[PDB]
Design an enzyme around this catalytic site. Structure first.
Site, mmCIF file in Angstrom:
data_model
loop_
_atom_site.group_PDB
_atom_site.id
_atom_site.type_symbol
_atom_site.label_atom_id
_atom_site.label_comp_id
_atom_site.label_asym_id
_atom_site.label_seq_id
_atom_site.Cartn_x
_atom_site.Cartn_y
_atom_site.Cartn_z
ATOM 1 N N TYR C 26 -45.243 -24.808 -8.343
ATOM 2 C CA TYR C 26 -44.074 -25.410 -7.728
ATOM 3 C C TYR C 26 -43.838 -24.902 -6.311
ATOM 4 C CZ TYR C 26 -41.193 -21.253 -7.809
ATOM 5 O OH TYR C 26 -40.677 -20.005 -7.574
ATOM 6 N N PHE C 36 -36.878 -21.929 0.738
ATOM 7 C CA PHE C 36 -36.484 -20.675 0.121
ATOM 8 C C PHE C 36 -37.495 -20.128 -0.868
ATOM 9 C CE2 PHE C 36 -35.229 -21.491 -4.311
ATOM 10 C CZ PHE C 36 -35.366 -22.857 -4.342
ATOM 11 N N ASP C 37 -38.508 -20.901 -1.247
ATOM 12 C CA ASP C 37 -39.421 -20.451 -2.283
ATOM 13 C C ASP C 37 -40.725 -21.224 -2.225
ATOM 14 O OD1 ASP C 37 -40.388 -18.975 -4.300
ATOM 15 O OD2 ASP C 37 -39.041 -19.739 -5.853
ATOM 16 N N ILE C 56 -33.753 -22.792 -15.046
ATOM 17 C CA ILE C 56 -32.485 -23.510 -14.992
ATOM 18 C C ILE C 56 -32.616 -24.878 -15.644
ATOM 19 C CG2 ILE C 56 -31.287 -22.396 -13.108
ATOM 20 C CD1 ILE C 56 -32.843 -24.066 -11.192
ATOM 21 N N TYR C 82 -26.831 -23.200 -10.785
ATOM 22 C CA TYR C 82 -26.231 -22.281 -9.813
ATOM 23 C C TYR C 82 -24.916 -22.838 -9.264
ATOM 24 C CZ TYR C 82 -30.770 -19.940 -9.825
ATOM 25 O OH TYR C 82 -31.923 -19.289 -10.193
ATOM 26 N N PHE C 99 -37.044 -29.901 -5.123
ATOM 27 C CA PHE C 99 -38.229 -29.232 -5.643
ATOM 28 C C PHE C 99 -39.456 -30.092 -5.433
ATOM 29 C CE2 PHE C 99 -37.080 -25.434 -8.002
ATOM 30 C CZ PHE C 99 -35.709 -25.519 -7.940
#
Lengths: 123, 420, 107, 48
Positions: C26, C36-37, C56, C82, C99
């Site tokens: 991912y 962020f990732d 999540i 979140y 995503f």
């Protein structure tokens, strides 16, 4: 300085407007901080002023300056047109339209790199 | 409030030498087409997604640089207001993705063929992928400059060009009104693949540095264009009879004879006897071509005067041998210009006239509803010399030049001088 | 608020069932676009078991809605992940997440 | 708006292989080796 009669303000005055190599060409002033439009759209009294989302700034063209040669408005960061022959026709503007497979349109979006008016269109 | 760091990929941009633009005086078409077949794409060689878009771009505005720029980086086609990109499922323009509705929409997978429909009359760009059209088009963009196809790619991408039948082979039929893209090649330069606005060029010795490229302007495709004194009024038919006699000597030298019909395959010339033997439409043509090249001779600033009519009349005709006489037996006798030597000022002026005469001719041809292509399509209004004169190749440039060098020294042999 | 827009189609028939592991390569962003990732930078195919609520809620609901080898773009709403407070230090409060996943193998 | 500014050349570039293959396949172009860089953002201006 900002007074009781005047807001906080900043000016631009020409140094050498007399003789001895008075340079003059169309310069472009941008401020330093952006404003940000919200993520999703909506689709004085202390009540209205603490809920409002609409803002105001102001410029004042002094005497001795023609509004025919003054352009005021808004500019997004991806704008790099540096020319001395700029008129409002020389503004990038691209219209994006999308529709269905039937051909009937669904939306007609126009992105421009510049959002201004002409001061000569009022005086 | 702080600075952010990230690893990103490099992008470049490539193009053919196909710069199509429209204007008032338009020798160009304004509605084109080309195809791109993708056959080898790794989706993830790097940490970032493999960048690959296809579209159209202006000349003077789109300047991709290999690092930095607008946005987060790796900016290419569609990443500002100067180009319009498509990746398979997004319309890239003004540095924003636009989600599209395509049937079987996905990225540019291998074994896919994309197409770009372009219109300059209405501001319009469309797309079809694998024969299937997309549900979205661009409008109302500016028209101050030329346009060329662009594909911006990251690393790990192998792709081929489909330009036209002489170079590619169109895997789909163009929609009617859309010319194959190998037609807008200029006569001076062959078709070639190049980057854009570059500075590094890897050389033999070692990495060359280049300066800025000199771009063809927007209006480099539009062509360009009084009283007559009585001392030149009488000599106008004199050079006209000289021109037809020089033409019939040029006709008889290859094999044209005097025939009642005009058959070039049979080598027949109905103007092979004399200028008076030329027909009245050709006799009126020889005079109206005489008055045109003289009214423009004074128009550029060349002063003309009349002198030495005795030595002009004392100059006889050029000698015509038995090989010079054609099958009719009547060899024309044009005025001898072996005594007159053209000046470099005249060698400068002989080019400026043939530049004007060719461009004012194509000006009539552009008013006749004609546009340029590399191929010659007469019913589809294509003539391969439909450019301004400096864009014309040297062969036709010499051809009108040796045509107009005949009338100069005979008029200098008629005694008339030329100021510069 | 689980919107799956496809990027490349997979097998179309193989789906993850419950009590099973997945391997997802991912990466994520925010709506501003700030990355962020990722996973490929760590060079590790991220794995997890479905159903057991390790990830999540907007993730595993997107996960079983994919085929094997498919590449999908997800959009998890604020209320699904979140929600009020967000992650400490990373994800701000009331943030919509974006995503890019890919089911590598194992259903 | 100043007209020009000093930037920095990178130390390596994309190796591009352009070659026309066949009179009907056309002009081919490819690249295989990846080359990356680090980038700051200056988020107030979106100019990396």
């Amino acid at each position: 300085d900002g007074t009781v009669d005047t807001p906080p303000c900043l000016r631009l005055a020409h140094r050498t407007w007399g003789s001895q190599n008075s340079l003059v060409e169309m310069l472009f002033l941008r401020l330093s901080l952006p404003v940000q439009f919200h993520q999703h759209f909506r689709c004085d009294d202390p009540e209205i002023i603490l809920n409002t989302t609409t803002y105001y700034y102001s410029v004042r063209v002094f005497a001795g300056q023609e509004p025919s040669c003054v352009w005021v408005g808004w500019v997004t960061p991806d704008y790099h047109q540096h020319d001395m022959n700029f008129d409002l026709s020389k503004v990038r503007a691209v219209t994006v339209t999308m529709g269905d497979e039937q051909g009937n349109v669904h939306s007609s979006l126009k992105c421009s790199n510049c959002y201004m008016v002409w001061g000569g269109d009022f005086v | 409030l702080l600075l952010q760091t990230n690893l990103i990929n490099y992008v470049t941009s490539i193009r053919p030498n196909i710069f199509v633009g429209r204007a008032e005086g338009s020798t160009q078409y304004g509605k084109w087409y080309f195809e791109v077949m993708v056959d080898e794409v790794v989706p993830f060689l790097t940490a970032q997604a493999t960048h690959l878009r296809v579209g159209w771009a202006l000349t003077e505005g789109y300047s991709p640089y290999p690092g930095g720029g607008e946005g987060w980086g790796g900016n290419g086609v569609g990443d500002d207001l100067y180009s319009y990109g498509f990746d398979g499922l997004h319309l890239w323009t003004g540095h924003v993705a636009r989600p599209v509705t395509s049937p079987g929409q996905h990225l540019l997978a291998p074994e896919d063929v994309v197409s770009c429909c372009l219109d300059l009359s209405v501001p319009s760009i469309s797309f079809r992928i694998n024969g299937c059209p997309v549900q979205g088009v661009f409008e109302a963009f500016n028209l101050d400059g030329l346009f060329f196809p662009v594909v911006s790619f990251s690393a790990g991408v192998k792709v081929r060009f489909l330009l036209g039948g002489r170079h590619g082979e169109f895997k789909f039929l163009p929609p009617p009104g859309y010319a194959p893209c190998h037609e807008a090649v200029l006569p001076r330069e062959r078709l070639r693949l190049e980057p854009i606005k570059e500075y590094r060029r890897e050389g033999p010795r070692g990495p060359h540095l280049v300066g800025p490229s000199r771009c063809l302007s927007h209006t480099d495709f539009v062509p360009c264009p009084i009283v007559l004194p009585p001392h030149l009024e009488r000599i106008r038919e004199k050079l006209a009879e000289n021109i037809h006699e020089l033409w019939a000597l040029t006709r008889i030298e290859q094999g044209w004879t005097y025939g009642p019909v005009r058959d070039d395959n049979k080598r027949l010339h109905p103007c092979l006897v004399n200028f008076h033997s030329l027909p009245e439409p050709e006799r009126n043509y020889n005079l109206q071509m005489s008055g045109e090249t003289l009214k423009t001779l004074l128009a550029l600033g060349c002063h003309v005067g009349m002198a030495d009519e005795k030595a002009e009349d004392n100059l006889k005709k050029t000698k015509l041998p038995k090989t010079y006489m054609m099958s009719n037996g009547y060899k024309p006798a044009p005025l001898d210009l072996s005594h007159v030597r053209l000046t470099p000022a005249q060698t400068t002026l002989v080019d400026r006239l043939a530049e004007n005469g060719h461009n004012v001719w194509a000006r009539d041809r552009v008013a006749q509803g004609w546009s340029y292509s590399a191929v010659q399509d007469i019913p589809a209004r294509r003539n391969p010399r439909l450019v301004p004169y400096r864009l014309l190749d040297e062969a036709t440039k010499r051809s009108n030049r040796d045509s107009l060098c005949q009338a100069v020294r005979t008029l200098l042999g008629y005694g008339y001088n030329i100021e510069p | 608020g689980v919107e799956i827009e496809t990027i490349s189609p997979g097998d179309g028939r193989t789906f993850p069932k419950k009590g099973q592991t997945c391997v997802v390569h991912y990466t994520g962003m925010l709506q501003n676009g700030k990355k962020f990732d990722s996973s490929r930078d760590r060079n590790k195919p991220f794995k997890f078991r479905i159903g057991k609520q390790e990830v999540i809620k907007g993730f595993e609901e997107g996960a079983a809605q994919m085929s094997l080898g498919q590449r999908a773009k997800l959009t998890c709403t604020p209320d699904v992940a979140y929600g009020a407070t967000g992650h400490p230090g990373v994800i701000p409060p009331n943030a919509t997440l974006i995503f890019d996943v890919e089911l590598l193998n194992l259903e | 708006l100043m007209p020009v500014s000093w930037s920095r050349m990178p130390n390596h570039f994309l190796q591009v292989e352009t070659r026309r293959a066949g009179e009907r396949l056309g002009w081919a172009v490819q690249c295989q080796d990846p080359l990356t860089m680090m980038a700051l953002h200056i988020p107030e201006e979106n100019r990396c």
